[PDB]
């Protein structure tokens, strides 16, 4: 997604040539030094064995010519917070004294209270009168990075769950629709146009022509430019890279305007996921311990579905016996599989394929072969070629299927650059519209990850008095003990935005709305809003906005002032005896789909060095039975199962075949022999 590409850039990796490695990395270099403020985000970082070593630049940070990381600051003079931005490194920062970003200036640069929270030289935080303050942060969210700046209500989340949300915002797959978030931040738009994929007009003009493939703009003076759209391009991690125009033939577009969208962008701004109706009750244990239960609508209406393009490769090369050729003519195979193949091997565009289907009909010289003596003398009389070959064609791995997008062919006959010894090289793209299924990982923005336990039908889902089913149900026991109470506030503000609101300005304005900006006292339904990171909607403002939540269509407030609602059970019919917290939450589809995870092996390739089964899902591979698992088996006392797992399932090269035959024939299992790996150990000791 664009966010991941943007965040990989601006990343600061503390490890590499000339730097400490993981094993050499201690437990102090990974901390958050007080000098990281404004120069390296303390939230965003990998949570594996890379904590602290890998980070990202803050939003406002700039690199000094020498290499140090500068940060802008508003210099305060004579108690007046001027707008003369000056960039300071860590040395200048700690030499002088810096005040906090959110201080109440009296609209002229003078603070209200004498004591303001100030950062001193050695990282200390104290209170100082408004006489010694020498510098001020440009704004809040100067400490966070781009990925973390997109988490609404960040100042209510905890560092652990904020870190998880920042890490997970870089993993969402691009959906097909990519609706913008109802509740977000001002960082979405800038993070989208700077990500690069959003096609932007460099110079203003008037749109001349628009189509799916090109957008031709006419400039003010003579020159015309046909921006070439990038449709269905495979990204590095297998996702789609569609760009769709968002302008028409009559529009005029200023320089720097978003002319077209990218994968996860909706009319310019970042859109990593979809807003679904969320309920926060424990529903029949299907959403138990981080499990999430979706509605079948998300499958019916394609709310959460993503296009995944996989790429396969095969090369025909000059072999010792001759050359390798790709032809429809192939050694013995039923002719029906040739139906999809074209006249010259590779399959035809738009052809569905499944596991075991042929993508590139390929043959190679079988090898030196012996004719029957009569056949050999007859063939010597003929002068006939052996015509032997052995079929070895590109077939998709197990658990793959979908339409074929593109066949890209490279040949020496076409005068291309190929590796030496390779005559032909053909790429085949296969796409699949992966729906949302059981086990697929879903996560909001505040670290509420979870697989999909069950996808109930639309009928048996809790529905408000209006009759709208709740699209997802999250467990309530996961919220309080993680201190990520921004998902609840995001839920409340999402409901407020979806249903709109109108503050009753009949008698002035309510006190809680005194500081509310104008043109927020009213908001029509589906009114997208934004809460900046460390300066956003307060709790009081949320309570007020929930007080006035103008009725949808009839005279009815589905969600009362407490943010909760009266929900009707989908199965029993009777309502739940207490109101439930309902709202709209922006949840996403992480790139941890089940179809990429499931694996099963009963027989596959073996390691030639030691005859254990191969490893991994790319090959067939068998799940490792490590030392700890054997310790558990020994603890149980199961001697025979341990012998089975270690002798005739893995290494008894003479035993595996016998076991296969015994099970096929139904006989008793043969007794295990001696593992081949022990023989390897013996030979090495010798």
């Amino acid at each position: 997604n664009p966010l991941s590409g943007l965040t990989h850039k601006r990343r600061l990796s503390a490890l590499g040539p000339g730097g400490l490695s993981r094993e050499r990395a201690g437990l102090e270099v990974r901390d958050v030094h007080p000098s990281h403020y404004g120069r390296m985000c303390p939230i965003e970082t990998p949570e594996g064995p890379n904590i602290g070593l890998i980070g990202s630049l803050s939003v406002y940070a700039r690199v000094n010519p020498f290499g140090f990381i500068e940060t802008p600051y508003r210099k305060v003079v004579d108690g007046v917070v001027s707008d003369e931005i000056v960039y300071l490194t860590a040395d200048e920062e700690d030499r002088h004294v810096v005040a906090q970003a959110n201080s109440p200036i009296d609209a002229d640069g003078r603070f209200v209270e004498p004591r303001v929270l100030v950062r001193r030289k050695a990282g200390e935080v104290e209170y100082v009168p408004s006489s010694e303050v020498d510098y001020m942060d440009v704004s809040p969210r100067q400490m966070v990075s781009v990925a973390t700046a997109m988490i609404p209500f960040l100042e209510h989340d905890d560092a652990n769950r904020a870190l998880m949300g920042a890490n997970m915002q870089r993993q969402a797959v691009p959906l097909v629709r990519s609706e913008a978030p109802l509740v977000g931040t001002g960082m979405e738009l800038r993070a989208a146009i700077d990500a690069g994929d959003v096609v932007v007009a460099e110079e203003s003009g008037v749109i001349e022509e628009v189509s799916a493939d090109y957008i031709t703009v006419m400039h003010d003076n003579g020159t015309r430019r046909t921006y070439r759209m990038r449709k269905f391009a495979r990204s590095n991690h297998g996702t789609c890279a569609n760009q769709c125009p968002i302008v028409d033939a009559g529009d005029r577009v200023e320089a720097g305007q978003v002319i077209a969208d990218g994968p996860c962008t909706d009319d310019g701004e970042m859109a990593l996921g979809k807003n679904l109706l969320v309920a926060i009750m424990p529903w029949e244990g299907h959403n138990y311990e981080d499990a999430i239960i979706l509605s079948n609508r998300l499958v019916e209406e394609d709310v959460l579905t993503s296009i995944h393009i996989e790429e396969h490769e095969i090369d025909a090369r000059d072999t010792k016996l001759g050359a390798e050729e790709i032809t429809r003519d192939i050694p013995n195979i039923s002719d029906e599989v040739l139906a999809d193949l074209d006249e010259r091997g590779i399959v035809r565009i738009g052809a569905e394929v499944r596991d075991g289907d042929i993508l590139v009909g390929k043959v190679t010289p079988k090898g030196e072969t012996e004719l029957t003596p009569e056949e050999r003398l007859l063939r010597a009389i003929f002068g006939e070629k052996a015509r032997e070959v052995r079929d070895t064609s590109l077939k998709v791995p197990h658990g793959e299927s979908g339409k074929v997008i593109g066949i890209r062919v490279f040949s020496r006959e076409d005068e291309d650059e190929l590796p030496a010894g390779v005559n032909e090289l053909v790429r085949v793209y296969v796409a699949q519209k992966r729906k949302i299924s059981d086990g697929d990982k879903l996560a909001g923005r505040h670290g509420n990850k979870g697989v999909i336990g069950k996808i109930l039908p639309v009928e048996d889902m809790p529905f408000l008095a209006d009759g709208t089913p709740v699209d997802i149900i999250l467990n309530t026991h996961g919220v309080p003990r993680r201190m990520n109470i921004g998902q609840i506030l995001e839920t409340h503000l999402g409901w407020c935005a979806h249903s709109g609101w109108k503050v009753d300005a009949a008698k002035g304005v309510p006190d809680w709305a005194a500081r509310l900006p104008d043109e927020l006292l009213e908001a029509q339904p589906n009114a997208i809003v934004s809460t900046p990171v460390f300066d956003g909607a307060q709790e009081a403002e949320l309570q007020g906005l929930l007080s006035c939540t103008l009725p949808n269509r009839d005279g009815d407030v589905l969600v009362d002032a407490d943010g909760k609602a009266m929900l009707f059970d989908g199965r029993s019919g009777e309502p739940f005896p207490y109101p439930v917290t309902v709202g709209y939450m922006y949840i996403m589809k992480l790139h941890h789909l089940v179809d990429d995870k499931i694996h099963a092996r009963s027989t596959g390739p073996y390691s030639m060095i030691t005859q254990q089964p191969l490893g991994g899902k790319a090959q067939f591979g068998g799940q490792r039975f490590g030392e700890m698992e054997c310790w558990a088996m020994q603890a149980y006392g199961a001697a025979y199962t341990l012998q089975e797992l270690l002798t005739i399932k893995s290494d008894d090269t003479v035993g595996r075949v016998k076991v296969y035959e015994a099970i096929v024939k139904g006989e008793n299992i043969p007794e295990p022999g001696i593992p081949e790996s022990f023989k390897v150990l013996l030979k090495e000791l010798q």
Binding site: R74, G186, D267, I528
Partner: peptide, 26 residues
């Protein structure tokens, strides 16, 4: 001044911000 104004085709994403930003993001 609500919304991020210095971008032409900005959807009117009203904002709750109380503090003006002296410096736009780089």
């Amino acid at each position: 001044s609500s919304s991020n104004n210095s971008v032409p085709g900005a959807p009117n994403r009203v904002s709750f911000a109380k503090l003006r930003e002296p410096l736009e993001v780089p």
